[PDB]
Design a binder for this molecule. Structure first.
Ligand SMILES: Nc1ncnc2c1ncn2[C@@H]1O[C@H](COP(=O)(O)OP(=O)(O)OC[C@H]2NC[C@H](O)[C@@H]2O)[C@@H](O)[C@H]1O
Ligand SMILES: Nc1ncnc2c1ncn2[C@@H]1O[C@H](COP(=O)(O)OP(=O)(O)OC[C@H]2NC[C@H](O)[C@@H]2O)[C@@H](O)[C@H]1O
Ligand code: NA
Ligand code: NA
Length: 172
């Protein structure tokens, strides 16, 4: 369906909305929802816990089965699994965990995976539990992704700070 509404257009292909990503997925029924994951697909808190909780833990069982068969992901890597009741597909992407000293440059590698999908509902990778600057995560997204990406930012204060930062980045 991909029926997105109420987004602010930042560039030709990046959009942003002050919204919860699970509530957006339930309203839009997208082809692809992005999970901000770790390499073992152990869905803890933040976006990963929210999506898994909305699938009634189905996402975790599937991920456990995927990892057992295939082994862990690499940082900057991804895998496509079921979106369960939220989306057709879920793209699990691993941003660098800068809190564990992983290389912030792998955020470029992480967002590159979006380019295999016509349209995506996504969060800001690495910007929460993994400790990257949200503004920096938005910049890499804008500089790296060429396909259609609708970003869900649930916190209204972060959203307002992100837009103001983006305007500053664009005019300077
Ligand atoms: N109507 C509604 N129902 C249910 N859940 C909702 C709703 N609206 C929003 N949400 C989302 O439920 C989520 C509850 O908060 P939570 O899952 O705890 O997110 P976090 O605050 O942990 O975000 C993770 C990271 N952000 C920066 C910090 O470093 C955290 O590590 C939060 O994202 C809300 O936006
Ligand atoms: N429900 C929801 N909707 C929208 N945006 C959200 C939500 N929950 C968190 N966020 C925001 O999305 C951003 C991504 O943070 P997070 O979900 O912690 O992902 P990370 O890439 O930083 O960390 C990944 C790790 N968290 C649990 C996973 O199992 C990974 O180990 C950050 O700005 C959060 O405040
Ligand atoms: Na900054
Ligand atoms: Na604000």
């Amino acid at each position: 369906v991909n029926s997105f509404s109420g987004y602010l257009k930042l560039t030709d292909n990046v959009y942003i909305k002050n919204a919860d990503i699970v509530e957006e997925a339930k309203k839009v029924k997208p082809t692809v929802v992005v999970n901000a994951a770790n390499v073992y697909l152990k869905h803890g808190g933040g976006v990963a816990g929210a999506l898994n909780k909305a699938t009634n833990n189905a996402m975790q069982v599937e991920s456990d089965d995927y990892i057992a068969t295939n082994g862990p992901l690499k940082v900057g890597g991804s895998c496509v699994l079921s979106g369960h009741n939220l989306a057709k597909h879920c793209l699990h992407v691993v941003g660098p965990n800068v809190n564990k000293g992983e290389d912030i440059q792998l955020l470029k590698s992480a967002y590159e995976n979006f380019n295999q999908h016509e349209v995506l509902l996504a969060p800001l990778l690495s910007a929460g539990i993994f400790g990257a600057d949200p503004i920096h995560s938005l910049r890499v997204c804008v500089d790296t992704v060429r396909t259609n990406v609708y970003l869900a930012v649930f916190d209204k204060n972060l959203y307002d700070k992100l837009v103001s930062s983006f305007l500053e980045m664009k005019s300077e």
